[PDB]
Design a protein around this ligand. Structure first.
Ligand SMILES: CCCCCCCCCCCC(=O)OC[C@H](COP(=O)(O)OCC[N+](C)(C)C)OC(=O)CCCCCCCCCCC
Ligand SMILES: CCCCCCCCCCCC(=O)OC[C@H](COP(=O)(O)OCC[N+](C)(C)C)OC(=O)CCCCCCCCCCC
Ligand SMILES: CCCCCCCCCCCC(=O)OC[C@H](COP(=O)(O)OCC[N+](C)(C)C)OC(=O)CCCCCCCCCCC
Ligand SMILES: CCCCCCCCCC(=O)OC[C@H](COP(=O)(O)OCC[N+](C)(C)C)OC(=O)CCCCCCCCC
Ligand SMILES: CCCCCCCCCC(=O)OC[C@H](COP(=O)(O)OCC[N+](C)(C)C)OC(=O)CCCCCCCCC
Ligand SMILES: CCCCCC(=O)OC[C@H](COP(=O)(O)OCC[N+](C)(C)C)OC(=O)CCCCC
Ligand SMILES: CCCCCC(=O)OC[C@H](COP(=O)(O)OCC[N+](C)(C)C)OC(=O)CCCCC
Ligand SMILES: CCCCCCCCCC
Ligand SMILES: CCCCCCCCCC
Ligand SMILES: CCCCCCCCCC
Ligand SMILES: [Cu+2]
Ligand SMILES: [Cu+2]
Ligand SMILES: [Cu+2]
Ligand SMILES: [Cu+2]
Lengths: 382, 236, 382
C-alpha cells in the first residue's frame, strides 16, 4: 500500500519477485497462511540504494494483523537481518498467523539498510473470527509455556504504577503547602531558609534511601526469579544460500524501448536468440510487480493479484514458436491499466529513465526460461 | 579643494594592472602554463611568482613605513577643514581597498574556480594560484593595511586606540592568505574532487565573513567625517 | 598535461592503457576524431584510492576545444558515472568533435570517485578552422532542432537583465534622496520615523506584489511553453561489460627490480615460463603511459605519442625465441628519456616503492600475449 509512490525506475530495478504463491486466501484467527516465492536481486542496482549487504525479509501489512511465525531465505530461518548478493536469486517463505479480523493487503517486502523498503506484490487476505481468540504460545528453555499476548503485562503495569505513585507521592507531599506565588515571594524578599526545614530534609532522605533500597531489592528479586536470562539476539546473518539456477538458453537484446506520454502501454523491440533444442515462445513480461501475460502462450494459475495481473496485456508482433538456433526481432507491447494505476508511467518524473524486468519464455512441453532485460526507456509524446 | 583626483588614480591603477594581468594569463594560460614541469612554465609563471612576491614585499614595506613615518604627531592642532580633507583621503583609501577586495576575492577567486574545474591542477602554483593567492590577495592586504595606517595616523577619531571593526576588516581578509595552506593541504591530501564547495574551502569563507566589519568601519568613518564639519545642514 | 606531477607508483598501479588508437591527427572544425583503446584495472589498487565503484570516462583537454559527442565502455554509451571491477579489462571509445582551432594535447582519462584523476596517454591533435563555424545541433523529443552553442542564451540574458533591472530600480528609488550620513544622524539623534513614510510603504508593497506576481506569471508561461520537461538524468550505471580475454600462456615472475638514482633506466630480472605451443619473444614493457619497445621484436604503427614511445628502449639480455615449456631468467632493462621526463624516476619520493606494468610477448606469427607484472622497485645509489 506503500508502493505506487516510490520512483518507477527504482521499483523496476531493485528486486524482481516471481513464482509467488499464497497457501490460503481466507483464514480464521490462529490459522496459518504461508507465502512462498523467489526474488532476484537486479545487477543494475541503483547507486542511490546501498548494496543489500544488510537486508531484512519483512511483511507489508497494517500493523500486527498477522504475526510472523517464521520467515526463511533459502531454507533457513531468518529472524535477523541478512546479507544478499547482487545478481543472485533467492527463494523465500514467510509463515503468518492470523491475529486481527478484516481484509488485509499483505505484501512481501525487503528492507535494505541504506535504501529503504522494496515492496513486492500485495495480496488481499481475509481474516475472520475474533481477536480475543488469538493465542501466541511459546515454550522457553526453562520449561514454561507463556502467551506472548499478555506475558509480563501485569508485572510491567505493576512496576510502572508503583514508581509513578512514588513520584506522585513526592510531588503531593511538597504540594500540600502553597506552591508558587508565596514561595516565590519568600525566596525573593530576603533569604528564604524557611520553606525547606526539618522534617522536610528527613522526608527527602527517606525518599532517596527507599528509592535506592527498593531498586536494589527489586533487582535482586528479579534475579532470583528468572535466574536464567540471555541478552537480545541480534546481528546480520551471512551465508544466505542462493538458488543455483541453470544458465538460460534464451538471449534477448533490447533494441530501444518506448512508452507513450500519456498512455497505459510500454513498447520495446527485442532480438531473441533461441539456444538449446526446443521451440520457445514469449509468455510473460514482469517489470515491477506487474505481470503482462500473453494468454495464448501462458496462463496464471497461482492466484496472482488481479490488479497486478494483465492476462492479455502482453502483445508480441510475431509470437510464433522460435526454433533453436534461430534469431528474430519482434515488437513487444505491454499494455494494461496497471501501468497507470501503479504509476509506472510516472518514470517521466524520474531522474533515471531506465527500466528492468523479467521475460518468461515457454516451450511446447511447458518448461520455462527466465531472462532479464534492462534498457533505457524513452518517452514518446507525438 | 577637499576630494581631489587621487580617487581616479586609485580606481585606474587597479583596473589597468588587473586588465593587463588578465591579458597575460589569457595569453600564457595554455601554451606555457599548462605543464608545471615544462621549462617555459618556469620562465612565464614561476618567474612571475618570484617577481610578484619580491615586489609585493618591497611595496608593502615602503608604503607602510612611509605612512607610519609621516604620521601626524600634533593631531590636536588640526583644523576642521584639514580634518575633512584627511577624511576624504581616507575614504579614497577605503575605495581603493574595496576595489582591490573585489578584484581579489571575486574576480580572480572565481577565475581560480573556472581554471581548476577545467584543467587538471599540476602543482600548488598554477597560473591561477599565482595570480589569485600571491598577487591579488597580497595587493588587497597591502591596500587594507595602508588604509588602516592612514586612518590611525591622520584621523584623530581613529587615533588614540585600535578600532576593532577596522582591525577585523583589515586582518580577516588577510587571514585568507595563510589559509591557502589549508587549500593546498586539503586538495593534495583530503578531497581530490574539484568540488568548489568542499569544506577545505571554508577557510576562505570564514575569513571572507570578517570583511563584513566594513559596516562598523564605515559608520566609524561617518562619525569621523561628522566631527567638526558635520554641517550644518545635516540635522538642521 | 596534469600527469608528470602525480606519484609515480600511483600512475604505475591504477589503470594500464593499451591498444590505444586515434582516428585522425589533424581535424577541421565540426570534424569528428575517435579515440579507441583498452584499459585494465590493476589488481593491486592502492588503498589510498577508493575502489572504482563510481568512475567516469573523461577527456583530458584544455576546456571544450573538443566536445564529447559520444563515449563508450564496452559497446554502450556512458554519459554518466560507471562502476568498474578491479582486475577487469574494458575497451573504450570516445568520439570528439572539433570546436576550437589550435594544437591540443588530448588525454583519455578515468576519474574515480574517491581517488581523483587517472590520466592516460595524451596525443597532440591539431584543429584548423574558425570557432564561429562550430555547430552543435541536437533534436529533442518534442520535434525541434536547436544549436547547443546559443540555445536559451537570449532567454537567460533577458531574465537576468530584467531581475537585475528590478533590483537596481529599487536601490535607485531609495538612492535618489541622501543616503548615508544625514540618515545616520536622523536615526541616531532622536526617533527617525521620518525617512520612511508614504508613499515609500506603498512603493515597497508594489515592489513585493509585483515580484511575486511576475514570478508566478513567468513560471506559468514557462510551463505553457515547454509543457514537456524532464529532470536532470543522473546516476551511476552498473553492468559494464568487460573484455573476455583468453588466459595468458606466459607466466612471468619478477625476481627483484632496480633503478639507478639518478638515471633514466629501470632494470628487472624476470623468470619467463612459456606455455602453449609457440615460441614467444618479449616485445614491449608498458609501465605508466610509457611503452618500452624491443625494436627487433615489435614496432609501433598506431601513431603512439613519440615522447611516450621508446622504440628501442627495451633491452633484453637474451630475447631469443622462448620454446614452449621452456623456462629462462633474463635481465630486462627499460631505458629512455621518458623515464625522467615524465618523472617515473621520482618514485624515490613516493611512500610506496612498488611498480606495476604490462609485458607484451609476441610469437613468430605475430599474435601477442599480455601479462601483468608488479614487484617492489628498489633504488640503487652506488
Ligand atoms: C602590491 C604590489 C604588487 C607587486 C607585484 C606586481 C607584479 C607585476 C607583474 C610581474 C611580471 C613578471 O614577474 O614577469 C615578467 C614578465 C614576463 O613576460 P616576458 O616573458 O618578459 O614577455 C614580455 C612581457 N609581456 C608578456 C608582458 C608583454 O616580463 C616583464 O618584464 C613585463 C612585466 C610588466 C609588469 C608591469 C605592467 C602592469 C600593467 C600596467 C598598470 C600597473
Ligand atoms: C607574507 C609572506 C612572505 C614570505 C615570502 C617567502 C620566503 C621564502 C624563504 C625561503 C624558503 C626556502 O628556500 O625554502 C622553502 C622550502 C623549499 O622546498 P623545495 O623547493 O621542495 O626543496 C628545497 C629547495 N632548496 C634547498 C633550494 C630550498 O620549502 C617549501 O617547499 C616552502 C616553499 C613555499 C613558500 C611560500 C611563500 C608564499 C609568500 C606569498 C607572499 C605574497
Ligand atoms: C585542536 C583542534 C585542531 C584539530 C585540527 C587538526 C587537523 C586534523 C588533521 C586530520 C588528520 C586525521 O585525523 O586523519 C587523516 C585522515 C585519514 O583518512 P584516509 O584513510 O587517509 O582517507 C583517504 C582520503 N584521502 C585520500 C582524500 C585523504 O584523512 C582525512 O580524513 C582528513 C580529514 C580532514 C581533517 C582536517 C579538517 C580541517 C578543518 C579546516 C576547516 C577550517
Ligand atoms: C605603485 C604604488 C603607488 C602607490 C602610491 C601611494 C601614494 C602615497 C600614499 C599617501 O600617503 O597619500 C597619497 C594619496 C593622497 O594622500 P596624502 O595627503 O598624500 O597622504 C598624506 C596625508 N597628508 C598629506 C595630510 C599627510 O592618498 C591616496 O588615496 C592614494 C591611493 C593610492 C591607491 C593605493 C595603491 C596601492 C597599490 C599597492
Ligand atoms: C602581519 C599581520 C599584522 C598583525 C596585526 C598587528 C597590528 C595591528 C595593530 C596595529 O597596526 O598597530 C601597530 C601600529 C599602530 O600604532 P601602535 O600600535 O599604537 O604603535 C605604534 C608603534 N609601532 C609602530 C612600533 C607599533 O601600526 C604601525 O605602526 C605599522 C607601521 C609600521 C610598520 C612598518 C614596517 C613593516 C615593514 C614590513
Ligand atoms: C569590472 C571588471 C571588468 C573585467 C573586464 C575584463 O576582464 O576584461 C577583459 C576582457 C578581455 O576580452 P577582450 O576585450 O576581447 O580582449 C582580450 C584581451 N585579453 C585576452 C588579454 C584579455 O574584456 C576586456 O578587456 C574589455 C574591457 C573592459 C574594461 C572595463
Ligand atoms: C560545516 C559542514 C562540514 C561537513 C564536512 C563534510 O562535508 O565532510 C565530508 C567528508 C566526507 O568525505 P567525501 O565527501 O566522501 O570525500 C570524497 C573524496 N575523498 C575521499 C578524496 C576525500 O567528511 C570528512 O571527511 C570529515 C569532514 C570534517 C569536517 C570538519
Ligand atoms: C551507594 C549505593 C551502592 C549500592 C550497591 C549495591 C550492590 C549490590 C550488589 C548486588
Ligand atoms: C563521512 C561523514 C562526514 C560527516 C561530517 C559531519 C560534519 C558536521 C559538522 C558539524
Ligand atoms: C502567498 C502567495 C502564494 C502564491 C501561490 C500561487 C500558486 C499558483 C499555482 C500555479
Ligand atoms: Cu498494500
Ligand atoms: Cu532481477
Ligand atoms: Cu597533456
Ligand atoms: Cu593493469
Amino acid at each position: 500500500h506503500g508502493e505506487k509512490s516510490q520512483a518507477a525506475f527504482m521499483r523496476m530495478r531493485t528486486i524482481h519477485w516471481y513464482d509467488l504463491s499464497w497457501s490460503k486466501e481466507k483464514v480464521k484467527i490462529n490459522e496459518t497462511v504461508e507465502i512462498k516465492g523467489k526474488f532476484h536481486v537486479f545487477e543494475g542496482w541503483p547507486e542511490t540504494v546501498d548494496e543489500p549487504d544488510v537486508a531484512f525479509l519483512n511483511v507489508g501489512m497494517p500493523g500486527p494483523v498477522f504475526i510472523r511465525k517464521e520467515s526463511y531465505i533459502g531454507g533457513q530461518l531468518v529472524p535477523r537481518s541478512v546479507r544478499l548478493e547482487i545478481g543472485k536469486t533467492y527463494d523465500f517463505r514467510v509463515v503468518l498467523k492470523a491475529r486481527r479480523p478484516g481484509d488485509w493487503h499483505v505484501h512481501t517486502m525487503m528492507n535494505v539498510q541504506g535504501g529503504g523498503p522494496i515492496i513486492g506484490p500485495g495480496k488481499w487476505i481475509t481474516v475472520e473470527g475474533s481477536m480475543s481468540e488469538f493465542r501466541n504460545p511459546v515454550t522457553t528453555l526453562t520449561g514454561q509455556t507463556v502467551d506472548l499476548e499478555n506475558y509480563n503485562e501485569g508485572n510491567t503495569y505493576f512496576w510502572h504504577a508503583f514508581w509513578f505513585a512514588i513520584g506522585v507521592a513526592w510531588i503531593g507531599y511538597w504540594s500540600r503547602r502553597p506552591i508558587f506565588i508565596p514561595r516565590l515571594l519568600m525566596v525573593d524578599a530576603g533569604r528564604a531558609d524557611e520553606l525547606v526545614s526539618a522534617t522536610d530534609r528527613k522526608v527527602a532522605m527517606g525518599f532517596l534511601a527507599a528509592t535506592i533500597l527498593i531498586v536494589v531489592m527489586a533487582m535482586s528479586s528479579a534475579n532470583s526469579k528468572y535466574p536464567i536470562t540471555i541478552p537480545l539476539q541480534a546481528g546480520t546473518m551471512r551465508g544466505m544460500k542462493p538458488l543455483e539456477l541453470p544458465a538460460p538458453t534464451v538471449s534477448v537484446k533490447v533494441e530501444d524501448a518506448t512508452y507513450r506520454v500519456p498512455g497505459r502501454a510500454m513498447r520495446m523491440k527485442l532480438t531473441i536468440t533461441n539456444h538449446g533444442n526446443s521451440p520457445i515462445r514469449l509468455g510473460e513480461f514482469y517489470t515491477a510487480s506487474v505481470r503482462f501475460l500473453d494468454s495464448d502462450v501462458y496462463k496464471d494459475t497461482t492466484g496472482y493479484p488481479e490488479d497486478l495481473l494483465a492476462e492479455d496485456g502482453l502483445s508480441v508482433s510475431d509470437n510464433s514458436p522460435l526454433a533453436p538456433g534461430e534469431t528474430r526481432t519482434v515488437d513487444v507491447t505491454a499494455s494494461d491499466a496497471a501501468w497507470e494505476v501503479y504509476r509506472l508511467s510516472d518514470i517521466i518524473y524520474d531522474p533515471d529513465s531506465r527500466f528492468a524486468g523479467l521475460l518468461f519464455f515457454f516451450d511446447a512441453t511447458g518448461n520455462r526460461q527466465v531472462v532479464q532485460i534492462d534498457a533505457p526507456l524513452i518517452p514518446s509524446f507525438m | 579643494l577637499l576630494d581631489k583626483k587621487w580617487l581616479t588614480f586609485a580606481l585606474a591603477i587597479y583596473t589597468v594592472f588587473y586588465l593587463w594581468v588578465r591579458w597575460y594569463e589569457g595569453v600564457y594560460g595554455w601554451s606555457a602554463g599548462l605543464d608545471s614541469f615544462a621549462p617555459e612554465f618556469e620562465t612565464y609563471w614561476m618567474n612571475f611568482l618570484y617577481t610578484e612576491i619580491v615586489l609585493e614585499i618591497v611595496t608593502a614595506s615602503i608604503l607602510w613605513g612611509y605612512l607610519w613615518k609621516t604620521r601626524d604627531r600634533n593631531l590636536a592642532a588640526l583644523t576642521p577643514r584639514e580634518e575633512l580633507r584627511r577624511n576624504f583621503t581616507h575614504l579614497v583609501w577605503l575605495v581603493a581597498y574595496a576595489w582591490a577586495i573585489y578584484w581579489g576575492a571575486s574576480y580572480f577567486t572565481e577565475q581560480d574556480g573556472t581554471w581548476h574545474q577545467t584543467i587538471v591542477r599540476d602543482t600548488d602554483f598554477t597560473p591561477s594560484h599565482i595570480i589569485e593567492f600571491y598577487l591579488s590577495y597580497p595587493i588587497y592586504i597591502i591596500t587594507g593595511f595602508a588604509a588602516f595606517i592612514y586612518a590611525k595616523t591622520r584621523l584623530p577619531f581613529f587615533a588614540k586606540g585600535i578600532s576593532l571593526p577596522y582591525l577585523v576588516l583589515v586582518v580577516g581578509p588577510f587571514m585568507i592568505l595563510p589559509n591557502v595552506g589549508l587549500n593546498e593541504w586539503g586538495h593534495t591530501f583530503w578531497f581530490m574532487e574539484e568540488l568548489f564547495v568542499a569544506p577545505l574551502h571554508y577557510g576562505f569563507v570564514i575569513f571572507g565573513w570578517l570583511a563584513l566589519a566594513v559596516m562598523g568601519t564605515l559608520t566609524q568613518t561617518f562619525y569621523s567625517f561628522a566631527q567638526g564639519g558635520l554641517g550644518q545642514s545635516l540635522c538642521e
